[PDB]
Design a protein around this nucleic acid. Structure first.
Ligand SMILES: Nc1nc2c(ncn2[C@@H]2O[C@H](COP(=O)(O)OP(=O)(O)OP(=O)(O)O)[C@@H](O)[C@H]2O)c(=O)[nH]1
Ligand SMILES: [Zn+2]
Lengths: 440, 356, 135, 42, 246, 323, 113, 62
RNA sequence: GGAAGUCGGAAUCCGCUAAGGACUGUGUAACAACUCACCUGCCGAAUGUACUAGCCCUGAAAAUGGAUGGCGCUCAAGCGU
RNA sequence: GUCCCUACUGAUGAACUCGUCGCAAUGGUAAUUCAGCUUAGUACGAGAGGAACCGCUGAUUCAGAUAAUUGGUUUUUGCGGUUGUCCGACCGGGCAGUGCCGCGAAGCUACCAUCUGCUGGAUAAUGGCUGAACGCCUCUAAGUCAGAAUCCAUGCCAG
């Protein structure tokens, strides 16, 4: 559902100030040398204990808010491994846990020391030593606390990707038109500017098709590296292409305004093909306004048709600056994703057991249409007024009365007094607004 | 308890004073600001509510209302006041001729054996030279005073009380120059003023009286528990209270003979309950129907005055429509509103057949 | 959003904390034991009390073991305490009964045995649609 | 919540007094002064 | 034509409204956002009435009727009965019945030609229903639910039935009724169809949080004047139904 | 303070639960001759310690417990829970083929939720302990369970009586007498061919019994009384209404039962048509008072119910029924 | 509004007068006073108490059959509002009520003959 | 309400502009500052909600 | 991946000079653009850095209402001679 | 093995001839929190979700009253029933420290019932205008605008 509910984590100096002001202001501070030594010990035992549970509640809040990578869907696990260097993430969280236990150990030791103290002065120095030792332990946490604040703000600004839902993945080279297709279909704000790496991260959009919700993921864009060495940016698109279940839309630019050769674009598609070993792959031939399919070299037609000769790969055409091809490439892909997911859902339930599943029975109860056996339709009463009636539109300047606008002119929700006699139908119109007798 | 009502002592006077009249501006029309009446009792009504935003909107609500009997006050005087660094000072009181014996009973503690000589020489200065002493004292009010008040008294013979001593009270005139309100006060002498003219229907008013006395009680009931702040025993009740924002639901005439009749129930009946108000009697005059509870016991004089400020609620701008008014017996579980429909329901009785 | 009722007029509270009231739905529970009243304040030594149309935290004492495993919200639908409505009618029911609901105001059961108080049906539309008798 | 003596609560009440409740009370005072003028002049 | 609406922040349209082929009943309260969304769909074609029944807001669960009659329980006062009589034309028969099951909208389902009643309704109520509504009366349960009005919605063109109704129960109910019947949900998976949506022969008003697939089956079962959905769309857009409600 | 807990803190053990187990062992000796011990809820350093002393040392001591207690040395202690099937298979892999000779369970739920939620959660955990005990026990084995006094304890006593041979409610010394902390022991495991599913099911065990006959004599012979219905309503029977013909009231053998339970005696003609109904209407008896009482049975008193019973005896004298 | 009649004794129950008891089967009982309600809860029969109107009808102390008592009834089919009908209805009940009283008086003289 | 001596006119020269002019710099600048302080967003994000009325040019009429 | 003084690591030179850092900040995806250091022109004669000494403010306070003894005192009715 | 003065809460009161109407120094002081409708499925948002000002209506706590209605209370010993005993029986009554039971007005009561709770000025944190110190600059120095449930008052209690 997101990770924006993580409370902010302060630096080392603010953590000391928060903890120490909390002890000063929420507990009494006046003690006297003339009091009993048991009262003197109890005053300083309370100060040391209070500082400990204040520290333990903020340390526990940081640990129990950041995501555990083990209890995660494995798309998100390599994403935050790429984004945050997951080895450093568990080291920084380990240093919070170690400092939490060391503060508890100091409080346990110095409460015992306060038990055997004899004077107010000795109780005062033991309180100060425990508080200063806790303060030096937080001061050593300065580097982990800066790191944990940067990841939290990045995690709060991370898009919500549902890996199990219907998904359209747009991948390809830089400057082919990956981001312009997303804005054309979804109303997601993805930067479109003509330089190499504009899309720095993963952008998500949503569309509606056949009264169903879909996801469109915009990726940064990958180069022709052999995947052993890549960018942090490029690998983020790689783990999106591998650990999600989508319909990959590979974008190729026939015209050479992308800054890369057609031979390089074909070769990347062949190299990253094993990442798409399960899902369907569609090739979208983009920027058709510049160069069409037919003025290309017939040798280059043979290779991309041999790409089509591979089993599940299909080649479609579009133009993201005229919008005359981007509409049906949305309809074609989303329809093919609709059929496969239904067929997978029907198979899970019609498995080889001889019995139809329980959860496939309910949908078949839902989809079934019950009709009368006689076939005689019941006769329908619809007046002739509505068959010529005009649809109400709020932007039309010639609308009807629409009593909510009577309310707005005459007051509001709590001021306007409705009249009920105006809808009364009587033999004489003067007989409304009458005081009808009731008791005689 | 509240520390605002801290001197929990008995009220200094039975009538109870206004203590604050509304702030006056000269641009308003001339009007009086307070009145007096006598508490009769309470009844039950049904009001057709018009409260937009309420769950009882355009529905029937049953509410408790209080009846205050209001015979017409008679104006007998005029008192002028001047501004001072020490406060406000009374400069001149001008009475009228032909003062009634009722208000004359007020200036005596033993009326039955006195010679009744009050205001006898004051009746002679109205015809001494031509009335020079009277006109001089009014011109002193016109040219020196900053606000003027009216002395008015109620009549006890119109009310069913064994008392005969009238209640005399000062009522402030607001809205005009000091010259204009003086010519009101002299013209209003010897004249009855009805509650139809002072107040109006659908108006929050301010009710001032002395509460029910309970004598010496302990801290269980005086404070409400399980120096001044320490709960100590003493007098509970007979305290002066000023209540705020009570709606006038009806102003009966007393002549109309269909006071409890509404536009929806066509029964010609009056406000007096069937058998009479318990421990009060019959209301034969103008009456004011006040929504809700109101301080003071039955038979006690009630002081009504105008609200000090302009209201900030839609409850004050609400037109009140009554469906029916209860007139059944206060003396028991009365199921009959008028005498006529009790004999219609019961049928012929033995005493009715023997008499006829 | 808490399950405090919105726009309910003042009426005489009849069921305090620690009262056994009947379960009127067909979820399987037989009685409900009130342990907390939703929306009711607590100043000092005052037992919170509920009326018709007030959801409370209840525990099933007798009934189906599955429903006995957890604490449940429950809206009171009947009350033997005589209370007053704005139409002047003082009224009371034969017993105290309620129905188990979720925090959103939707009841687990499908039908309500006996009548439903008018204030409970007017405030909770799901109880109003499963009420056979509304009075 | 807001106090009864809050500055913005007072400013809302002053807008109610001037614009809504003002002309209502001025109209009812014209009728009542007219009836008092009738009695005093008679 | 099916539109979404809300009486308040509540999505239960059928609880607060009653829609027939000649009149519409709307609960009276606060603003007229609920009223205007009905007026914007009925441009003074059939009369509309702001009504209270028994001093409560839940009008759709206490009354039941078709274009020939209107029925109200015994708790309605004479003022609400007269307000209903003056508002509606004389072609509507208004009757107040002394049935102990006072929630008539929960226990009676009716269209112009048939009626489903509660099994333990009285004989004097059943004969009055046939007389006033002018329809034939049957006693049935909708998937072992005796409050038929809450869990089943019906017009002369089709009906929407509780989702967990068995296929065998759908065939015998549709044959007895003469209209196509499809099980489905309203208001994001709620089983209370009658309390969630109101339907007549040419339009339907449902809750706001009903889903896009759920609004498609309301368009399909209840036909339109445009003739887009005749009820056979379900076997054509089965793929949407399969993925959405699996 | 507790004298047995103070004895443990001085010299004895970690807690007073070990004193509870030696009291059960003193009451009945089973730890002396057994070989395999399995504790479904290991008490911290107390129950495993007395298991280490009396039994042969280091002989299949399974210490599964959901609470992360300190691991007792020479006792195979697991910090995982017991209800999951994966933990059951983990138990299976650790015992190889040696099933447990004695099974022990400590029922310690979150007590405090009005003593009814806590009693069921204790009873549900006790039935879950019985499921694993019935899965793994030798013919003639011993089972030790902690239970709370309730109506579920009566059902738990019955299911141990049906499945085992020797049943004993211990209630020993060193036990908390303030609460309902009661030990039970089951011996004589019958070794059935198949474990019955609905016998171990918590729904069938904790299903409420059939309701007894309501005091119809109290509702008829003195209906001005009290004891209002604090329990709920029966399955079905909604709308709270019941009516039959007056002939079925006459023809029945229990006139008190029909009068108390039912709302109205009807004189409406059945569609087939009863000549007994038409004869009963046309009698010189049942005039006015009987017809008024038959319309509203729920508002009647002693004299009205008595007059109905004398009326049906007179019609049976007319009609010829034996009594 | 409507003047209700007491279930126990039949005197007119006006608004805010008495109490109303609702039973689990759907039936409401309106009472005019506490005396009527308390006698109902202890399950006494109003046909036997001599102050109730059920006894008087059962014992023949007021007559039930005649044309004027048939003319008043509870109406469940509303009529359209008509000012001429409502004014002429009011003159009818003035005539109806005085005809009843002059027939009530003859009925009482016949019993006392 | 403006100070006595400052006149406010709607600019029929550019979009969404008012002119506060007068003889007293104290009166003109204070009345301009009153408009800014009365249109100020509360309990929102300053970096995103940029709505308001702001002083653009200060100078002389002549 | 991109890194042009300004995400980083290390060096930090020369010319033209009146002077201008292989750059002090703003800014760009990188540039661009602005700005600082430094320099020249105009106005004008005294400035400005660090300390020291007095007087004054802060340099920590709980809990019935109260104390330069009180009123009160400000080119003193306070401080130094 | 160490019923009295005063304080407080109430009530009277001599002298000013008795009263009637008043003024107000001084002392006290009071309201509090939540929800719902509209704004609005709006601004904002990829989605999931999701406000606020103005306006309207209720509720919790506190405070001050009140008894039309509902419930409770019964020495109304008001009416009726009934146990023991007695006045010879009937009628009418007595005793059982008010025998018992039912209803029971009036009165007292109950957030177990109902009603009512009000507006000006000056400030603190802070945001500004003009403008020196200091030829830039500056909310402060002289001058000055706004702003908290705060402060002082009015409303309210005593006199
Ligand atoms: N003529 C033409 N130009 C296009 C078309 N689509 C995109 N472009 C241009 O080509 C550039 C493609 O860059 P983007 O739109 O950002 O797509 P991208 O492949 O994700 O590029 P990056 O975001 O930088 O990775 C854009 O700047 C457009 O100006 C097209 O359909 N026709
Ligand atoms: Zn009665």
């Amino acid at each position: 559902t997101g990770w924006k509910d993580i409370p902010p984590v302060p630096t080392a100096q603010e953590f000391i100030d928060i903890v120490l002001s909390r002890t000063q202001r929420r507990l009494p501070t006046q003690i006297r040398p003339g009091f009993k030594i048991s009262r003197i010990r109890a005053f300083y035992t309370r100060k040391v204990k209070f500082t400990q549970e204040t520290c333990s509640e903020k340390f526990g809040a940081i640990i129990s808010s950041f995501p555990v990578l083990s209890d995660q869907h494995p798309f998100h696990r390599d994403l935050m491994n790429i984004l945050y260097d997951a080895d450093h993430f568990k080291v920084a969280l380990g240093q919070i846990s170690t400092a939490k236990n060391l503060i508890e150990t100091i409080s346990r030791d110095y409460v015992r020391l306060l038990k055997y103290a004899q004077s107010l002065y000795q109780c005062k120095q033991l309180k100060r030593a425990a508080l200063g030792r806790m303060a030096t332990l937080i001061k050593r946490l300065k580097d982990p606390l800066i790191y944990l604040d940067q990841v939290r703000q990045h995690l709060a600004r991370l898009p919500d990707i549902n890996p199990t839902t219907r998904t359209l993945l747009v991948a390809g080279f830089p400057n082919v038109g990956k981001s312009s297709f997303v804005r054309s279909v979804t109303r997601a704000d993805t930067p479109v500017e003509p330089y190499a790496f504009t899309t720095k991260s993963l952008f998500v959009g949503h569309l509606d098709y056949k009264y169903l919700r879909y996801q469109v993921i915009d990726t940064p864009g990958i180069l022709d590296h052999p995947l052993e060495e890549m960018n942090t940016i490029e690998m983020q698109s790689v783990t999106a292409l591998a650990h999600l279940r989508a319909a990959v839309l590979y974008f190729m630019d026939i015209s050479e305004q992308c800054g890369f050769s057609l031979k390089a674009q074909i070769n990347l598609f062949k190299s990253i093909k094993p990442l798409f070993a399960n899902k369907m792959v569609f090739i979208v031939l983009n920027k058709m306004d510049i160069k069409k399919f037919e003025e290309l070299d017939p040798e280059m037609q043979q290779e991309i048709n041999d790409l089509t000769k591979s089993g599940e790969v299909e080649i479609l055409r579009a133009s993201c600056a005229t919008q005359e091809g981007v509409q049906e490439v949305k309809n074609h892909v989303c329809e093919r994703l609709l059929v496969e997911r239904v067929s997978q859902k029907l198979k899970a339930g019609t498995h080889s057991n001889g019995n139809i599943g329980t959860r496939l029975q309910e949908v078949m109860a839902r989809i079934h249409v019950a009709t009368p056996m006689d076939g005689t339709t019941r006769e329908t009463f619809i007046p002739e007024a509505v068959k010529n009636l005009k649809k109400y539109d709020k932007n039309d300047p010639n609308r009807r009365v629409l009593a909510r606008d009577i309310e707005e002119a005459n007051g509001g929700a709590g001021v306007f007094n409705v009249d009920l006699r105006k809808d009364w139908i009587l033999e004489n119109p003067e007989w409304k607004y009458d005081k009808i007798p009731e008791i005689f | 308890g509240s520390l605002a009502f801290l001197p929990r002592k008995r009220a200094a006077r039975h009538r109870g004073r206004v203590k604050s009249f509304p702030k006056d501006d000269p641009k308003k029309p001339v009007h009086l600001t307070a009145a007096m009446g006598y508490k009769a009792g309470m009844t039950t009504i049904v009001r057709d509510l018009d409260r937009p935003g309420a769950k009882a909107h355009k529905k029937e609500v049953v509410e408790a209302v209080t009846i205050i009997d209001c015979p017409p006050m008679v104006v007998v005087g005029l008192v002028g006041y001047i501004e001072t660094p020490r406060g406000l000072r009374s400069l001149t009181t001008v009475w009228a001729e032909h003062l009634s014996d009722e208000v004359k009973r007020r200036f005596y503690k033993n009326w039955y054996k006195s010679k009744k000589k009050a205001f006898t020489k004051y009746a002679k200065k109205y015809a001494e030279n031509n009335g020079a002493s009277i006109t001089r004292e009014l011109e002193r009010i016109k040219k020196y005073c900053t606000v003027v008040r009216v002395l008015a008294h109620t009549q006890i013979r119109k009310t069913p009380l064994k008392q005969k001593k009238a209640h005399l009270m000062e009522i402030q005139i607001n809205g005009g120059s000091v010259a204009d309100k003086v010519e009101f006060g002299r013209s209003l002498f010897e004249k009855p003023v009805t509650i139809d003219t002072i107040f109006e229907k659908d108006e929050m008013i301010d009710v001032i009286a002395v509460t029910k006395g309970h004598g010496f009680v302990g801290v269980t009931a005086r404070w409400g528990t399980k120096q001044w702040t320490v709960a100590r025993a003493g007098q509970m009740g007979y305290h002066h209270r000023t209540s705020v924002n009570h709606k006038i639901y009806r102003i009966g005439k007393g002549d109309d003979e269909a006071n409890a009749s509404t536009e929806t129930d066509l029964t010609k009946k009056k406000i007096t309950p069937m058998g009479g108000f318990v421990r009060y009697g019959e209301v034969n005059n103008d009456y004011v129907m006040i929504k809700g509870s109101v301080p003071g016991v039955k038979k006690r004089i009630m002081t009504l005055r105008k609200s000090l400020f302009t209201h900030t609620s839609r409850k004050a701008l609400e037109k009140v429509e009554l469906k029916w008014i209860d007139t059944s017996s206060e003396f028991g579980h009365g199921a009959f509103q008028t005498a006529a429909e009790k004999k219609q329901f019961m049928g012929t009785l033995k005493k009715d057949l023997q008499t006829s | 959003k808490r399950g405090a009722p919105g726009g309910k007029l003042k009426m005489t509270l009849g069921l305090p904390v620690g009262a056994i009231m009947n379960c009127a739905d067909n979820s399987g529970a037989r009685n409900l034991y009130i342990i907390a009243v939703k929306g009711a304040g607590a100043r000092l030594n005052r037992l919170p009390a509920g009326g018709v149309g007030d959801m409370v935290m209840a525990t099933v004492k007798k009934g189906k073991p599955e429903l006995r495993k957890k604490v449940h919200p429950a809206v009171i639908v009947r009350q033997a305490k005589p209370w007053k409505r704005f139409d002047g009618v003082f009224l009371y029911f034969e017993d105290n009964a309620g129905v188990i609901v979720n925090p959103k105001g939707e009841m687990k059961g499908s039908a309500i045995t006996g009548p439903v108080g008018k204030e409970a049906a007017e405030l909770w539309p799901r109880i109003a649609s499963n009420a056979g008798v509304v009075m | 919540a807001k106090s009864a003596r809050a500055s913005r609560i007072k400013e809302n009440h002053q807008r109610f007094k001037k614009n809504i409740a003002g002309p209502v009370e001025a109209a009812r005072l014209e009728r009542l002064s007219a009836k008092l003028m009738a009695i005093a002049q008679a | 034509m099916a539109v979404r609406a809300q009486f308040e922040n509540s999505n239960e349209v059928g609880v607060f409204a009653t829609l027939t082929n000649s009149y519409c009943l709307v609960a009276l309260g606060a603003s007229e956002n609920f009223y205007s969304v009905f007026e914007a769909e009925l441009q003074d074609v059939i009369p509309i009435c702001r009504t209270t029944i028994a001093g409560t807001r839940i009008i759709g669960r206490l009354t039941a009727g078709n274009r020939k009659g209107l029925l109200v329980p015994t708790t309605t006062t004479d003022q609400e009965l007269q307000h209903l009589r003056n508002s509606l034309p004389d072609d509507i028969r208004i009757q107040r019945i002394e049935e102990r099951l006072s929630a008539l909208g929960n226990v009676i389902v009716c269209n112009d030609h048939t009626a489903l009643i509660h099994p333990d309704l009285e004989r004097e109520t059943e004969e009055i229903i046939a007389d006033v509504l002018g329809v034939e009366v049957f006693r049935q349960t909708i998937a072992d639910h005796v409050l038929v009005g809450s869990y089943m919605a019906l017009s002369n063109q089709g009906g929407l039935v509780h989702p967990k109704t068995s296929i065998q129960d759908q065939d015998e109910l549709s044959s007895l009724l003469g209209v196509p019947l499809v099980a489905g949900s309203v208001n994001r998976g709620s089983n209370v169809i009658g309390g969630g949506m109101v339907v007549n022969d040419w339009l339907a008003v449902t809750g706001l949080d009903t889903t896009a697939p759920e609004l498609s089956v309301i368009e399909s079962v209840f036909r339109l004047g445009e003739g887009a959905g005749p009820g056979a769309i379900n076997t054509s857009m089965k793929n949407t139904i399969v993925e959405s409600f699996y | 303070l507790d004298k047995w807990y103070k004895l443990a803190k001085e010299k004895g053990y970690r807690a007073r639960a070990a004193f509870k187990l030696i009291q059960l062992n003193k009451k009945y000796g089973f730890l002396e001759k057994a070989k395999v011990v399995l504790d479904l809820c290991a008490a911290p350093g107390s129950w495993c310690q007395v298991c280490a002393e009396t039994m042969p040392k280091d002989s299949l001591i399974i210490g599964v417990d959901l609470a992360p207690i300190k691991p007792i040395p020479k006792v195979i202690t697991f910090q995982s829970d017991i209800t999951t099937e994966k933990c059951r298979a983990t138990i299976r892999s650790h015992l190889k083929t040696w099933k447990a000779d004695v099974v022990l369970h400590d029922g310690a739920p979150n007590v405090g939720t009005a003593w009814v939620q806590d009693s069921y959660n204790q009873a549900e955990l006790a039935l879950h302990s019985l499921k694993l005990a019935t899965e793994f026990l030798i013919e003639g084995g011993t089972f030790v369970t902690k239970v709370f006094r309730s109506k579920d304890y009566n059902k738990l006593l019955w299911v141990c009586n049906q499945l085992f041979t020797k049943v004993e409610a211990t209630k020993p010394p060193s036990s908390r007498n303030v609460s309902a902390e009661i030990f039970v022991v089951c011996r004589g495991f019958k070794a059935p061919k198949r474990i019955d599913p609905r016998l171990l099911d918590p729904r069938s065990i904790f299903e409420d019994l059939a309701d007894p006959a309501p005091n119809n004599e109290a509702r008829v012979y003195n209906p001005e009384q009290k004891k209002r219905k604090r329990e709920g309503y029966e399955e079905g029977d909604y709308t709270q209404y019941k009516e039959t013909s007056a002939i079925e009231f006459i023809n029945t053998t229990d006139p008190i039962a029909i009068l108390a339970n039912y709302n109205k005696l009807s004189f409406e003609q059945p569609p087939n048509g009863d000549v007994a109904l038409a004869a009963l209407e046309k009698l010189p008896e049942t005039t006015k008072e009987i017809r008024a009482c038959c319309d509203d049975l729920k508002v009647l008193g002693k004299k009205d119910f008595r007059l109905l019973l004398k009326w049906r005896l007179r019609v049976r004298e007319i009609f010829g029924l034996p009594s | 509004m409507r003047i209700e009649n007491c279930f126990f004794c039949g005197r007119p129950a006006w608004p805010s007068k008495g109490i109303t008891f609702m039973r689990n089967d759907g039936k409401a009982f309106r009472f005019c006073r506490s005396k009527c309600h308390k006698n109902f809860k202890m399950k006494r029969n109003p046909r036997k108490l001599k102050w109730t109107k059920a006894y008087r009808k059962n014992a023949g102390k007021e007559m039930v059959v005649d044309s004027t008592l048939q003319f008043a009834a509870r109406r469940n089919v509303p009529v359209r509002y008509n000012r001429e009908l409502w004014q002429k209805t009011l003159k009818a009940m003035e005539r109806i009520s005085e005809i009843r009283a002059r027939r009530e008086r003859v009925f009482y003289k016949k019993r006392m003959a | 309400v403006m100070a006595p001596g400052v006149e406010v006119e709607i600019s029929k020269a550019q979009k969404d502009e008012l002119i506060l002019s007068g003889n007293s710099l104290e009166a003109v600048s204070q009345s301009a500052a009153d408009i800014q302080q009365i249109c100020k967003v509360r309990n929102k994000d300053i970096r995103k909600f940029l709505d308001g009325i702001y002083v653009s040019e200060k100078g002389n009429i002549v």
